[PDB]
Design a protein around this ligand. Sequence first.
Ligand code: BOG
Length: 325
Amino acid sequence: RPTFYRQELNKTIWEVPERYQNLSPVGSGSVCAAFDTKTGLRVAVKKLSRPFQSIIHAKRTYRELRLLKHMKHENVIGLLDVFTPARSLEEFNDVYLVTHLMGADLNKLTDDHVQFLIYQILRGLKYIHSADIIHRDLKPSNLAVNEDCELKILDATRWYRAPEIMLNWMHYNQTVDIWSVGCIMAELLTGRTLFPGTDHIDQLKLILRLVGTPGAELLKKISSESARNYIQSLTQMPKMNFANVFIGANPLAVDLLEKMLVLDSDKRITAAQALAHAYFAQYHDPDDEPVADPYDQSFESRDLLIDEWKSLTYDEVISFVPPPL
Ligand SMILES: CCCCCCCCO[C@@H]1O[C@H](CO)[C@@H](O)[C@H](O)[C@H]1O
């Protein structure tokens, strides 16, 4: 067990292994930047706020730990460390999570740079999706990059949200994330938000202006009577020609955008398919685009007591094995 020290930070007493030095609040659970003297990395240390206050808090804590422990990929945020000052389950109150300190996020670029950034996003998404996980909130502030332009997917704007989410469809597919990637890509290439909706309905309005109103094939798959009736009352607008929207873009980029920003989620390109697109020819390497181990999400269906979620969480803290540097 490492020696901890205590220090008042964000109006509470943080208690962290001495390897983590010079904690500096970075926002708000609450996060401090620190220097990990064991690894020589700048890291973010997150002290969970009220992790076991309620059954929901407790399940949420356990989810977040489970997810972070699972994610072991260059383009996805992972867990460098997880700790508690508690020496037993009985004393177990606080959970700290340690990750790479990400120095900037994506919040116009050259086509070479966009290729590289979007490649990294897709590589990470191929991984995430292979675990049967859907991000559901990809956006520029959830994409961290360092000074070598190495990108990691992390974790109110609706500008990047797939239309079916905006419509509370449920039954989302993984290509909700691909929609988001198309939106980010478009913006990197143009320097302008693709669908800067002012409110919820406006977001859908802007989306349909670009991609057209649903065709006959998509209409067949819409169970909602209210949705169908509204849609068929709309003035049928065709898909815009993306080649004339993204003026002067690499035609491969335009072709990729067309394959991502398809109204029907079943017809959007997958992350693995997109990595094989010619746009990424200079990065694509089937040998090093790994998939994830299977992720046991069964806990999501469970309604357990605080002390049970806590115990499970304590189990995961105890079993944690740091990554090799
Ligand atoms: C007027 C606005 C209409 C927007 C149409 C969104 C269509 C999204 O695509 C759909 O999404 C679902 C969710 O995974 C699926 O179950 C469907 O098979 C699919 O067609």
